[PDB]
Amino acid sequence: DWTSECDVLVVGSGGGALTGAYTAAAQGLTTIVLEKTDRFGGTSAYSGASIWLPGTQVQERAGLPDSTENARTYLRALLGDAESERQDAYVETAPAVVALLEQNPNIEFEFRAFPDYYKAEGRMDTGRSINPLDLDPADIGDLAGKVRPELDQDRTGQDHAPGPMIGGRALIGRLLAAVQSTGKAELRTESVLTSLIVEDGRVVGAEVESGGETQRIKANRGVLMAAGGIEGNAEMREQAGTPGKAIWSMGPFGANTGDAISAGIAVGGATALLDQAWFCPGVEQPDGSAAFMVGVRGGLVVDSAGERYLNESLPYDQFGRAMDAHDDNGSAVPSFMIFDSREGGGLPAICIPNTAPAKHLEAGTWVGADTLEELAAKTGLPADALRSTVEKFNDAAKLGVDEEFHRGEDPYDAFFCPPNGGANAALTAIENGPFYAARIVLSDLGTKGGLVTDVNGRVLRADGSAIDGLYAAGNTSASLSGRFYPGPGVPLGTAMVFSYRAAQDMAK
Amino acid sequence: DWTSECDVLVVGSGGGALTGAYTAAAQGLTTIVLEKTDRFGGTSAYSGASIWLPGTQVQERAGLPDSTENARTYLRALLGDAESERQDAYVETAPAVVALLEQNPNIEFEFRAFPDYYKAEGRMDTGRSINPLDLDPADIGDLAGKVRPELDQDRTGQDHAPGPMIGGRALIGRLLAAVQSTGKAELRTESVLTSLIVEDGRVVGAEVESGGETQRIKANRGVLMAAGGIEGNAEMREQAGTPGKAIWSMGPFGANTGDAISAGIAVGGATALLDQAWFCPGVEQPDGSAAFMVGVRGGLVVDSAGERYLNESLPYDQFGRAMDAHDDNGSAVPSFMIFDSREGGGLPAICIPNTAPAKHLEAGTWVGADTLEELAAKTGLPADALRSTVEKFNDAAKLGVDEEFHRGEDPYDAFFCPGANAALTAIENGPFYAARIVLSDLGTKGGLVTDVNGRVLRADGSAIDGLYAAGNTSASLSGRFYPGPGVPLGTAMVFSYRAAQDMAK
Amino acid sequence: DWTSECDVLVVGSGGGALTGAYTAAAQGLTTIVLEKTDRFGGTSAYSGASIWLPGTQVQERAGLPDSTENARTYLRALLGDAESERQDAYVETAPAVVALLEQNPNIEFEFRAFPDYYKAEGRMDTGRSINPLDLDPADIGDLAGKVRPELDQDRTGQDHAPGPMIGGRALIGRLLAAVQSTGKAELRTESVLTSLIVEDGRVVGAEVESGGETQRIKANRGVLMAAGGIEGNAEMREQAGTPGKAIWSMGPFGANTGDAISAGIAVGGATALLDQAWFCPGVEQPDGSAAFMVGVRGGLVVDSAGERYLNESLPYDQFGRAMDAHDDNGSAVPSFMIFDSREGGGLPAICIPNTAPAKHLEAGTWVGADTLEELAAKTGLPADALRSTVEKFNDAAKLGVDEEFHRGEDPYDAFFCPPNGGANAALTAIENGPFYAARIVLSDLGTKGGLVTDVNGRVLRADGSAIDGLYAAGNTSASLSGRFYPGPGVPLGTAMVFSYRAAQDMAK
Amino acid sequence: DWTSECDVLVVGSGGGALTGAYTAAAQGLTTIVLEKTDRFGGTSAYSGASIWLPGTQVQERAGLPDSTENARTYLRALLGDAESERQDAYVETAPAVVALLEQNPNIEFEFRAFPDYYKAEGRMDTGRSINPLDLDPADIGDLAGKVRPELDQDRTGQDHAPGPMIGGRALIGRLLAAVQSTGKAELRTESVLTSLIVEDGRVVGAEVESGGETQRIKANRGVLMAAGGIEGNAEMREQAGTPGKAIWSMGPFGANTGDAISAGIAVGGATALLDQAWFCPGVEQPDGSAAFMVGVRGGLVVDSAGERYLNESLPYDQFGRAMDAHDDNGSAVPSFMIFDSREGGGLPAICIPNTAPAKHLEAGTWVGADTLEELAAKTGLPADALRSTVEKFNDAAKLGVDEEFHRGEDPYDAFFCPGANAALTAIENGPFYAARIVLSDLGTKGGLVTDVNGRVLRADGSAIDGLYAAGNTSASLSGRFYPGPGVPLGTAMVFSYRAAQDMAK
Ligand SMILES: C[C@]12C=CC(=O)C=C1CC[C@@H]1[C@@H]2CC[C@]2(C)C(=O)CC[C@@H]12
Ligand code: NA
C-alpha cells in the first residue's frame, strides 16, 4: 500500500521548503522533497534572494544598528495586532534559523542595503535584509544544473548564463547542497502532490504523481506543504477575487497552481486572504506576459485619462495596490509609463526580464513619437490632458517638489536615482524626444493568501483546531503580513522561519 | 568640405579601439570614436575579458612568478621568428598600457587563473592573464545602456540582465567611462566608416555614413581602424579560403563585415592571413547559428564515420583546427558530440549562449535515444563503429588513460574537471544524446599588415602615412596559434595604444 | 634685493595650499611652497581626509543620487544668504577641482559614507563626501617621510606606523607627489613667512625666515596664504573672544599661530569670524592637551551640576557649541562624560589620539568608583543629582526614547552605534560598575575666522576692495560657513576649492 | 573541589590557542580559553599575521604555482630529517586548517607576496604565505576592544589607533569572533595558569589564578597550552643560554614568562631548543627596549671595530644569528647601523615601533655628525676603519657588487628596494648617523617536546596523557631555521588544530 516512507515529507522546493527540509534532515529525520517541475527553486530561484531575517548574527557582522525589538516595533506599527503572535514568532526565530543554516559549510549570508518600504517607527532607511553569497556552480557538483534559471533565461528557452550563480540561484543552490550534505534527504523532481492521506483524522502521508504512476508516501512525523500559492491558477484567482492575472504573474509558468492549498482545503483546512498577492507593476510583454518593474528612476505614469494618479517611486506592492484601487473597468490596468530619450530609448527602471525596446516597439506594447500629441493619438490618451500632465510634472521637477503625489520625499524613492539629476533626484523632466509610452499591468511575485496556520506552521480548521500532521509555509500559507509588504525579503523570510518552526515541531 | 575635425579618428568601439581612443584623449588629443551599430563594444563586449598582458603591475599585486622575458620565451617557442619584432613590442609594451589604464579611476584589473594553451617553455599552467573587475552599472551613468549585452541576452532580443556588468561588459563599460572622463573624446553610435580620404598620399580623414547623410571627418594626426575582421562577411571569407561560416561566427550579427579591411586595401594596404581565424567548436543552434563550446568536461566527439579523431579537451582554437584538418567534404563539419544523461540531459561543457536541451531536441540539432544503435540511425553514424568507439572510450575511462588521443594529460584538460582521470568519464547512463558541433569562430584574425606601431603597410613594407590598424582589422602577429587566454584583446589593446602614441609624436 | 623669484608663492602645506600649488604648477607657473615646520601637511595631515566636494565625477562613479543643485539647496537652507556668492562658487567649482586633481596619476578619490550634520532640505543621510585612496608609501619615494604623521604617533614622539598611509597622510602624500611631478614646483620645509612685501599697493612677494637667514621671495602673479588659522595662538584667541584654548586645539603643537592672518592685517586685510572655530568636544589628556572625541556610542554627559544639558550624539561642532552656550564661568567647560564598564573601562566613543584608560586614571583626568555616590564625591558633582540624572537616562534607554534632548532621533546619532539589542541603539543604560567620569573640554579642529576673501580667494579690505596680489584660503580665510559645520569635509573642501580658484585667478 | 568544567581547556590566546579553541568548540566540545593579561592575542596580535600555510584553497584562489610537495621539499632541504614527521604533518594539514577556518563567516584570508628566506629547492621567490583580511572593528562588536593593540600603541600607553584592524589585530579579532560564534566557548582575561592537575598519571585540569582567588578547572578531553615561550623570563633564558634579552624581546612586556613550559616540566615534560629564538635585529630605544628592524633598504652595519661583518639585507633571523656568531664580549651586540641623510635623517629600514629620529638623537641611541671622523669619535669606532669601510662599500655600490658579503644577490634583498644594484646605495650625503642595533627576538622557540598531534612527551618519548602544547610553548620543528614568513603562526595554528582533533577522537 505504501510506496515509500520517511519522517518528514516536504512538498515544493522553494526557499521555505528547502529550509524546512534542511532543519529536519540536519537533526536526523529522514526527509523526502517533492518538486513538481524538472527544476528546484520555483519563484524563489527567480528572486533577488533578499531575506528579511532581522537581528541575527549576519547583521552583527556588518555592525548594523538594529535589533529584534526594533524590527518587532516596525511590524506592529504596520500590521497592528492582527496575527501578533505570528509577528512575534517570525522576528524571534530569525536568529536561530540563520545560525542553523550558517553552520552548514554550504551556506553563508551577508547584509545588503535595500530600504524597508514604509515610513514608520522601526524602519531601516538602509534596510536590514540579508542575501546569500554568490556561488560558483562547480562547488555544488551536479546540483547546479538542477536549479531553475533566472527569468532572463527561463522564459527564452535558455539555461544558466555563464556567470556565477547569484540571488535566488545562489539561495537554492546552497540550500540544496546543504540538504544533500546531511545524507538524510532525498530530492525528487517531476513529483507532484495529488492529495493528502488521512487516517483517524491525522495526515499520515500523501498521494503523488511521478513517472506517470501514482505513489503513496508515508510521513511519520508530518507533511510540510510549501508549494507556492494560487498565482498560476486563473480559476482559483477569479473565485477569490484576486486582482491581476495568472499570465502576468512572475512565478514560473504553470508551476504554482494552488495544488497544496486545494489539498489542504480537501482535508478541512481554513483559508484567508485569497484575494491578496505580493503585487508589483509589470511591463507588458509582446507575448502577453509581464516583467517585474522595480527601481523606477524616471518618467511618470498616467491612467487612460492621461492623468497622474500615484507616486511612481512607491515600492512595487504599494504601486500595484494603487493601480488596483484606481482601476475602474480598465481605466488604470493598463496604465501608461511615459518617458523621453534620456536613456537612449530605455525605460527608466529595472525590468525583469529585460526585453529590448526594439521588440516592444515592433509589437506595440510600447509606442514612440516625436511629440506628445502623436504619442497621445497612438495610445488613445487625451492629447490636451497628457501635454498638460507632463508640463505640470516638468514644473515640479524644476522646483524639486511634487505637490500632487509627493514623489521623492522618502529614502526608497531616492535609493534608485542616478547622479546629477537636479533639485530632486527622483524628479526628472520629460523633454528630449522621441517620447515613449509603455503599457504597465498589474503583475505579482506570487499570491499571499492560503491555508491558515499557527506559530509552528500547523494548518488550522475554521474553529482554530490544528490538523494533526499537516503544516504549511510560504505562499501555500496565508501570510502574517496581511495587506502589507513591509520590506525586502519578507516573502522568503516568513517562508523560511515557519518552515523551520514546522520542522522543529515535527521533531518534538 | 569637412563636416568636423579631430586629431585622432577611431573606427570601432571594441577593447582595442577604446584603448587607443583613451590613450590619445588622455594626453590632450581631440578624439572621435565611430561605432557602426547602436551599441559599443562589438565582440569585445561578448568576451570574458581575459587579457594577455603579461609582466605588469597587476600580476605583481598577485605575487605571480612570471616576467616579461618568460612571456617572450613562450611566444618565441610557439610562433618562431615570424613577426618577432611585433612579439617583442607586444610583450614589452604590456606594462605601460596597463599602467596608463589603471591610472584612470574607472579602470582596475586583477589576475585570474586560466591556463595558457600549449605545452612549451614559458607556459603558465595557472595562467598570467588579467581581467577587469566587475562593474555596477549605476557607476558609469547613462553609458551602461550603450554597452552591447552578453550573448545570452543579445541574440534573444534582450538587454542586460540584472547582475553586475562582468567580463566584456565590464571591460567596455570601464573603457567608455575612462574615455568620456577625459573630456577630449566624442563617442558616436550608428556611424559607419565608408571609405578613407587621401591627400598627397596621406590618409587625412574618412567618409562616414551617419543619420542617413554622408559626413567627411578630418583627422589631423591619423585614423585608427579597429573595427573587427571579416568574420560576418561570407563573400570575403569564401574569397580568402577562411574555414567556418559567417552564420556560425560568434561576432555580433552583421557588425564585422570587413569594412575597415576593404577600405585599407582600397588605399594600398597589404593583407595577410585572411584564411585564418580565432577558431572554436560551436554547438549548432536551431536557427543555424552556433554557440561557443568551451570547458569540455565529459562526452566524446566523433566524425561522420562514428570514430574519435581528436582530444576533446583541447583548447578551443586547437580543437577547431583539428576539425578543419580532419574535414573531407563535411566528414568532420559537423562533428557529433556524444554524451549520456549524467547531467540530466545537459551537454558536458559551457555553451555560450546556453540554449536549453529541449529546444535543441525539438529542432533536431540534438538527437536523443535509449540505445546507441537508435542514436546512430537518427544521426546517420555507423551503428557498429559508434558502439565500438564508446566501448573503447569507456575502457579508457576505467583505466584513466586515453592511449589514442591522450586526453587528460595536460593542465588545460584538467582545469574544467574536479574517477581515475577527471577528464575521462564513461558514457553509459541512457538516454544518450548526439549534438551537432560546427566550426565556429571568435572573430577572424587576418587583415591589414602593420608594423610595431600599428601603421598599415603596402606590399613593399612602406607605411601608409596617417593610417593605423589594430585588433582583427589587422593581421595578427600570432599567425596560426592562439597562445593563451586574452591574446586577441591583448594584442588589440597594445597596438591601439602604440598607434595612439605614434600619432602623438 | 631678491633672493629668488617665482610666479606663485604658496605659504603653508595643508590640503588647500598643495591644491593651489598644484593648480598653478600644472599649468606652467613656477611655484614655491613654504612650510614652517619640518613636515608637510599640518592639521590636514592629521585629518580623516573626508572632503565635501559634491556633485563630481567621484560620486557619479558610486551611483550616488545627489547633485550640485541639491548640495546648493542644503547650504542655502543652513547658511541663508550670508555669503551666497561664495556658497555658489564652492559648490559649482567642486567638479572642476576634482577633475583636475584626478587627472594626475598620483591622485584618486572615492566616496565614503558619513552623514551630513543637520536635518534640512538637501541633506544626504549617508553623506556625499569623498576621500583619497589609501597609499603605499613606496609609491611616492622620499616624499612619504616628509609627511606629518597621524596624531596617535605625532604627540608620542613617533613617526609613521607600519600600515599604508591613509586619511590625511594619503591626501598630503598624494598631493605632494602630484605637485612634484609637474616639475614646476619647489617644496620647502622650515621656511616661515615673516611678512608680505608691497610695492605701489600690490603684494609682490614675501619676507621669509629659513636657515636662520632672512630671504625675500618675489611672486610675479601672487601669494596664496593657506597657512592655517589662529588656533595655536592663545593671545589672538583671547583678543578675538574665541572659546576653547590653544592647548586643547588638535592642530600640530606650535604650527598654526596666525602668522599669515597677521601678515594680511598688516597690509590692510579685513577679518571676520575670529571668535569662531571648528569646534569639537575633547577628552582632556594628562598633559593638559585634548583628544578629538567623535562617534559617541554610549554614556551620557553632565555639567558641573550633575545634569544633562545636550544630546551627546550631536555632531562634534554642534556638541561643542552647546558646551560653550551652556558655560557659565566653567560650569560646562569641563563637562563630565559618565560611563560604566560595558566596554571594559573604555570610553564609548572614538578618541584621537587614543590614550589608555589606565593613563587617564593615574593622572586623574578620569576618575573611577564602585558607586555613583563616590564618583560624585571624587569629581565634585552633586551626588543626588548625578544619581537622579542616571536613573532618568536609564529609564529613557529602557523605553528607547530620550524625551529631554531627543538623542537617537537622527541618522548621525545612529551611524556610530553597535548592535546591542536595545530599543534605541544610541541609548544604553549605565549600570555595570565600576563607573567612570571623564573630563571633557572644548577642543577644536582649527579656527575658522580670518581674512575676508571673495569668490576667487582675493583678500579684501574693509571696503570690499581687493588687495592686488594677495590670496587666502583654508583657515587663513574667514569661512563661508559662518557658525555652521554643514557636514564632513567642509574645512578641507572649502580650502581646496578656493586655493584652486585663487591659482586660476593668478593665471589670468 | 572543581570550580568549573569543560571538555577542552586552552591556556593562552595567541593565533594557535584560538585556532585550537575554535577547532574544538566548532565540533561541539565545551571550551574555556584563559588569557593571563587584560587583552587577547599576545605577540600574535602584534604580528603582521603572515602565515605559512602552503598549498591550500587560498593560494589556489590566487593562481599560485605551488603545492604541498613543493613546500615539503623546501622544508626537507633546510631542516634535514630532524623532525621530519612533524614537517610532514605541518605541510599536509595546512589545507584542512585553512578550510575549517574559512568556513566560519568571520574568517577570510588572502595570499600576500613576501619571499621565503633561504635559497633552496622549493623556495617561492614571491612567497606562499597568507594573511587575514583587514577588519572593521564594528563587525565584531565588543570584542575589538579586547584585542591587544599594535606595538606603536601598546608601548606608549595607547589603545587602537583609528584605522581598520590589520595584521595581528585582524587575525585575533577574527579568531575571537569565530570562537564566540560557536556558542561553545568561554573567553577569559586576567586568568593565569598556575599549575597542572594530574590524576592517575593523566592531566585532567589545571589550577588557575583569577580575581585574586584560586580556581580548579576540569578538562575532560585535555589541556592545550599555547601560552608563548620564555622570552620575557631573564632567568630561564640565562639558564638555557638563550642569546638576547627579555627587555629587547618584542613580546608584550611581562606576558610570556615561560609559565606553561614550567608547568609542563613539573609533570614530566621534556624540553628542547631552549637556547633558540625567533631572532631579529632591534633598534635600541631610549628606554632600553628595542624595535623590530625589518626591510633594510640602505646603510650598512659595522661591529665595534668599524668593520662590516654580514649581509645587512639578510632575513631578520639570519641577521640576528650572524650578530650572535660574531659577538665577542659585546663586539657585535651592539652593532652600529651607518646611514646618510638620503631619507631626511630616517633610518633606511622599517622599525616597529617607529620612534622618531629626534627622540633617539636626544637620548644618544643614535648619534649624528657632519663627517665620518666625528661620527667615529662620538660612537667610539676607529675613525680610519670606519672611513675605510664606507669607501669600500661605496665602491661596491658603484660597481653593483658586494664581493665581501654578497648583499643584493637574492630576491629577499631586492624585495625591499625599488643604481646598478638596488640593495647597494652609497653613503655620502651628510649628515651621517649611527644607530645602535641589538639582538631582539619575536618570541623564543624552545619548549616542550611534542608529537605530530601536539601531545607533550617525556624524555623517553612517551605521551603525557591529556596534555598538549603548540606555538612557542612547544619546541619548534624548525630547529635553528626561520624558513619563511609566517612559520611561527603557521606551526602554532596547525598543531593547535591537530591537538584539538586528537582530543576529539
Ligand atoms: C616580517 C614579518 C614578520 C614575521 C613573519 O613571520 C612574516 C612577516 C612578513 C610580513 C611582515 C612582518 C613584519 C611587519 C610587516 C612588514 C608589516 O607591517 C606589513 C607586512 C609585515
Ligand atoms: Na537571456
Would the CB atoms of C425 and A63 count as touching at under 8 Å?
no
Q: How many Å lie between the centroid of ligand 2 and the Cα of residue A156?
A: 6
Which residues in C lie closer than 8 A to residue A66 (C-beta atoms)? 419, 425
User: Chain B: residue nearest D110 by CA?
Assistant: B62
Indicate if D411 and D463 belong to the same structural domain: no
| Sign, CA torsion A198/A202/A204/A209 | positive
Q: Does B125 touch chain D (CB under 8 A)?
A: yes
Task: Look up residue D278 and give its three cell numbers.
Answer: 625567533
Q: Is there an atom of ligand 1 within 6 Å of D368 CB?
A: no
Q: Is there an atom of ligand 1 within 6 Å of D50 CB?
A: yes
B323 within 8 A of B281, measured Cβ to Cβ:
yes
Indicate if D244 and D336 belong to the same structural domain: no
Beta strands at B300-302 and B271-272: parallel, antiparallel or unpaired: unpaired
Would the CB atoms of C355 and D141 count as touching at under 8 Å?
no
Q: How many Å lie between the centroid of ligand 1 and the Cα of residue C313?
A: 39
C7 within 8 A of C32, measured Cβ to Cβ:
no
Indicate if C67 and C122 belong to the same structural domain: yes
CA nearest to B17, candidates B202, B185, B224: B224
- Residue of minimum CA distance from atom 12 in ligand 1: D48
- The phi and psi torsions of D175 (rounded to 5 degrees) equal -65, -40
Q: Which residues contact D241 (CB under 8 A, 6 or more apart)?
A: D274, D275
Q: Does D63 touch chain B (CB under 8 A)?
A: yes
Question: CA dihedral in degrees (C277, C283, C286, C289; nearest 10)?
Answer: -10
Indicate if B59 and B153 belong to the same structural domain: yes
- Count of domains forming chain A: 2
Would the CB atoms of B62 and D65 count as touching at under 8 Å?
no
Q: Is there an atom of ligand 1 within 6 Å of D41 CB?
A: no
Would the CB atoms of B159 and A343 count as touching at under 8 Å?
no
* Whole-Å CA distances, C175 to C164, C172, C192, C507: 16, 5, 21, 20
Kind and range of the H or E run holding A87: helix A84-103
Indicate if C283 and C348 belong to the same structural domain: no
From B389, B419, B437, the end of a domain falls on B437
Indicate if B344 and B416 belong to the same structural domain: yes
Indicate if C362 and C482 belong to the same structural domain: no
Query: Is B489 marked as binding a ligand?
Result: yes
- Residue of minimum CA distance from atom 8 in ligand 1: D485
Would the CB atoms of A419 and C67 count as touching at under 8 Å?
yes
Beta strands at D4-11 and D31-34: parallel, antiparallel or unpaired: parallel
Q: Is there an atom of ligand 1 within 6 Å of D44 CB?
A: no
Query: Is A50 marked as binding a ligand?
Result: yes
Apex CA C341: angle with CA C339 and CA C347, to 5°?
50
The nearest CA of chain C is from the CA of D144 a distance in Å of 10
Q: Left, alpha or beta for B181 (phi > 0: left; psi -120 to 50: alpha)? A: alpha
Of D138, D146, D159, the CB nearest to C356: D159
Q: Is there an atom of ligand 1 within 6 Å of D114 CB?
A: yes
Size of chain A, expressed as the number of residues it contains: 508
585564418: which residue's cell? B276
Indicate if B2 and B54 belong to the same structural domain: yes
The nearest CA of chain B is from the CA of C58 a distance in Å of 9
Which residues in A lie closer than 8 A to residue C70 (C-beta atoms)? 400, 421-425
Question: Which ligand ends up closest to the CA of B149?
Answer: 2
User: B235, exposed or middle or buried, with CB in 10 Å at 0-12, 13-18, 19+?
Assistant: exposed
Which residues in A lie closer than 8 A to residue B138 (C-beta atoms)? 418
Query: Is A196 marked as binding a ligand?
Result: no
CA nearest to D413, candidates D310, D342, D332: D310
Q: Is C100 helix (H, G, I), strand (E, B) or coil?
A: helix
Q: Does B140 touch chain C (CB under 8 A)?
A: yes
Q: How many angstroms separate the CA atoms of C105 and D18, rounded?
A: 43
User: Chain A: residue nearest C409 by CA?
Assistant: A121
Q: Is there an atom of ligand 1 within 6 Å of D166 CB?
A: no
How is C458-498 classified by DSSP, letter by letter?
EEE-TTS-EEEEEEE-GGGBPPTTTT---STTHHHHHHHHH
How is D248-301 classified by DSSP, letter by letter?
GB-SPTTT-SSHHHHHHHTTT--EE-TT-EEEEEEEEPTTS-EEEEE---S-EE
How is D181-247 classified by DSSP, letter by letter?
HTSSEEEESSEEEEEEEEETTEEEEEEEEETTEEEEEEEEEEEEE----STT-HHHHHHHT--S-GG
* Whole-Å CA distances, C393 to A343, C302, C339, C343, C406: 53, 11, 12, 18, 11
* Whole-Å CA distances, B390 to B302, B434, C444: 10, 12, 82
Indicate if A392 and A505 belong to the same structural domain: no
Would the CB atoms of C70 and A418 count as touching at under 8 Å?
no
Which residue ranges of C make up the annotated binding site for FAD?
35, 43-44, 48-50, 193, 256, 259, 445, 475, 492
Beta strands at B271-272 and B447-448: parallel, antiparallel or unpaired: antiparallel
- The phi and psi torsions of A210 (rounded to 5 degrees) equal -150, 135
Query: Is A167 marked as binding a ligand?
Result: no
Of A64, A69, A414, the CB nearest to C65: A414
The nearest CA of chain C is from the CA of B182 a distance in Å of 8
User: B213, exposed or middle or buried, with CB in 10 Å at 0-12, 13-18, 19+?
Assistant: exposed
B303 within 8 A of B332, measured Cβ to Cβ:
yes
Indicate if C226 and C303 belong to the same structural domain: no
First to last CA, chain A: 27
Q: Which amino acid is at A3?
A: T
Q: Is there an atom of ligand 1 within 6 Å of C162 CB?
A: yes
Q: How many angstroms separate the CA atoms of A178 and A184, rounded?
A: 11
How is B229-258 classified by DSSP, letter by letter?
-STT-HHHHHHHT--S-GGGB-SPTTT-SS
User: A241, exposed or middle or buried, with CB in 10 Å at 0-12, 13-18, 19+?
Assistant: exposed
Q: Does D429 touch chain C (CB under 8 A)?
A: no
Q: Is D70 helix (H, G, I), strand (E, B) or coil?
A: helix
Structure determined by: X-ray
Q: Is C369 helix (H, G, I), strand (E, B) or coil?
A: strand
Beta-sheet strands, E only, within A246-312: 271-272, 277-284, 290-294, 300-302
User: C37, exposed or middle or buried, with CB in 10 Å at 0-12, 13-18, 19+?
Assistant: middle
Q: Tell me the residue range of the domain where A26 lies.
A: 1-294+441-508
Q: Does B241 touch chain A (CB under 8 A)?
A: no
639585507: which residue's cell? D313
Between helix B84-102 and helix B68-79 the angle, nearest 10°, is: 140
Q: How many angstroms separate the CA atoms of D54 and D111, rounded?
A: 10
- The phi and psi torsions of A113 (rounded to 5 degrees) equal -70, 135
The domain that contains B442 carries what CATH number?
A: 3.50.50.60
Q: Is there an atom of ligand 1 within 6 Å of D361 CB?
A: no
Q: Enter the DSSP assignment of B402.
A: -
How is D348-377 classified by DSSP, letter by letter?
SSEEES-B-HHHHHHHTSEEEESSHHHHHH
Task: Look up residue C331 and give its three cell numbers.
Answer: 560650569
First to last CA, chain D: 27
Q: Enter the DSSP assignment of D473.
A: G
Would the CB atoms of D350 and C162 count as touching at under 8 Å?
yes
Q: Which residues contact D478 (CB under 8 A, 6 or more apart)?
A: D79, D445, D487, D491
CA nearest to D384, candidates D393, D375, D373: D373
Q: How many angstroms separate the CA atoms of A127 and C356, rounded?
A: 36
Indicate if D412 and D472 belong to the same structural domain: no
Indicate if A17 and A92 belong to the same structural domain: yes
Size of chain B, expressed as the number of residues it contains: 505
The domain that contains B372 carries what CATH number?
A: 3.90.700.10
Q: Is there an atom of ligand 1 within 6 Å of D192 CB?
A: no
Preceding omega of B483 cis (within 30 degrees of 0) = no
Q: Is C293 helix (H, G, I), strand (E, B) or coil?
A: strand
User: Chain B: residue nearest A48 by CA?
Assistant: B162
Interface-testing mutation among A91, A417, A420, with chain C (most C C-beta atoms within 10 A): A420
562547488: which residue's cell? A139
